[PDB]
Ligand binder design. Structure first.
Ligand SMILES: C[S@@+](CC[C@H](N)C(=O)[O-])C[C@H]1O[C@@H](n2cnc3c(N)ncnc32)[C@H](O)[C@@H]1O
Ligand SMILES: C[S@@+](CC[C@H](N)C(=O)[O-])C[C@H]1O[C@@H](n2cnc3c(N)ncnc32)[C@H](O)[C@@H]1O
Lengths: 245, 245
């Protein structure tokens, strides 16, 4: 229905396709084509498009949301080197040693604990010798600050949040080496403000395309996220590891 | 982008999925299962859904608009019996004698004259003996009433309009038997009015989902169409024929 599409596109507009964060996160990543890359939680395909353009790598985007996959395919028709599939990544199987990089931006919070482990084991199998695992995800921080409105928000969206430390260790337990686990919450805050800023600046143009209710919902939502981060309820985690085989 | 989707869903809302006209047009059509049916210009798939529900027919929907096909697929999962494909019907090939009925609602105006004929020749081939061809389409009427605003509207949308009489003769020239060609413009006005009435009645609800600009565009658009029809610029044509035994 129209409501789901409207929120998908409205969020894409305010995040400017997510291109700022992707750019920075891949700024020190080096691939030689024709590398093969998997993007877990590929959304509207922006990260896949960018990775292909920057590296001329084959990119395979998986997302559980069929609407988004449909849009992604439509946005990236010509490029034979970019592929998309609608499926729960937990139900995917790829051959051993298929990928040079497996990349995932803010998708893994959607998995319960055992399922996070299950995915990382899969990722280990699917990577080529020397392959890299590259992830951002939301992590638990000051649970002593967690309150009734926060818990109900996470419970409702079905997020499963863990500390950066435990996350890094969980990856390490799947045989990954060179495991790096960094708090990038300061950068998260900066991205969030820039996105709220864009929304407020462009309110009039936004309303030509989106109903007033959505503008208000997104403004209030971004405002809450910024407040959540400033209160240190959660950290944005950055993780990089390598399959050394 | 969002604008294209918004107009697709907004028009689907005001026409209530096309249910009313589809129900009437098929009221004296009898099929036994498991008939096969082709819907040319299937849009969001509502006609396909209805035909499968009413007859337990296998239905194959073709539309040139990939966005609509994508939505149609998502709206109709379980029904193994309903299939969709994004393609120009002119580029499609089916084995001879595949279908019990070929059905098309307000699509063929999108085809230039030679292409209309090519399509009907294809339809003749694709039908089983005694198979039914069932079409509604917009036809030219009082061309002495056409003015610069009407000409520019059709030239811009790339419509090719011909008189009901010539349309009927064209179908006959492809070997179809028992060709019926009827003016249903009275019925067309009644549908248009009801759709405009729905839009005006539900303005406040419509605006929770659609931008104010779309409401105005659709209201003015439906107002124009009603005006065009009353001025007898065009007729809504009904055509039914059968392949010879
Ligand atoms: C917030 S988004 C981020 C994706 C976006 N392309 C970006 O720039 O990060 C998280 C995505 O992960 C997808 N997702 C959630 N659970 C998933 C699963 N089990 N398998 C695959 N994708 C999933 C969601 O549909 C959503 O599109
Ligand atoms: C006004 S719509 C009606 C759609 C659907 N029959 C209905 O009644 O809702 C006409 C449809 O024909 C489709 N169409 C136009 N040219 C076509 C072609 N060459 N092949 C297949 N579909 C086409 C358009 O995309 C559009 O969805």
């Amino acid at each position: 229905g129209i409501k789901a599409y409207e929120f998908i596109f409205g969020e894409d507009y305010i995040s400017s396709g997510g291109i700022v964060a992707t750019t920075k996160i891949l700024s020190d990543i080096y691939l030689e084509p024709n590398s093969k890359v998997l993007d877990i939680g590929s959304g509207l395909g922006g990260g896949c498009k960018y990775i292909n353009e920057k590296y001329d790598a084959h990119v395979y985007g998986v997302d559980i949301c069929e609407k988004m996959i449909a849009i992604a395919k439509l946005r990236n028709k010509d490029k034979s080197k970019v592929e998309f599939e609608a499926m729960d990544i937990l139900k995917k199987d790829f051959p051993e040693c298929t990928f040079d990089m497996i990349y995932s931006r803010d998708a893994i919070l959607h998995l319960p604990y055992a399922d996070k482990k299950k995915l990382f084991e899969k990722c280990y199998k699917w990577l080529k010798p020397n392959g890299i695992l590259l992830i951002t995800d939301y992590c638990a921080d000051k649970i002593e600050n967690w309150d009734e409105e926060f818990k109900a928000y996470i419970n409702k969206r079905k997020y499963t949040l863990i500390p950066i430390q435990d996350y890094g260790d969980l990856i390490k337990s799947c045989n990954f080496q060179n495991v790096q686990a960094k708090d990038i919450s300061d950068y998260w805050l900066e991205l969030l403000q820039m996105e709220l800023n864009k929304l407020e600046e462009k309110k009039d143009e936004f309303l030509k395309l989106y109903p007033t209710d959505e503008y208000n919902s997104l403004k209030d939502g971004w405002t809450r996220k910024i407040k959540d981060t400033k209160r240190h309820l959660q950290k944005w985690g950055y993780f990089k590891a390598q399959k050394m085989v």
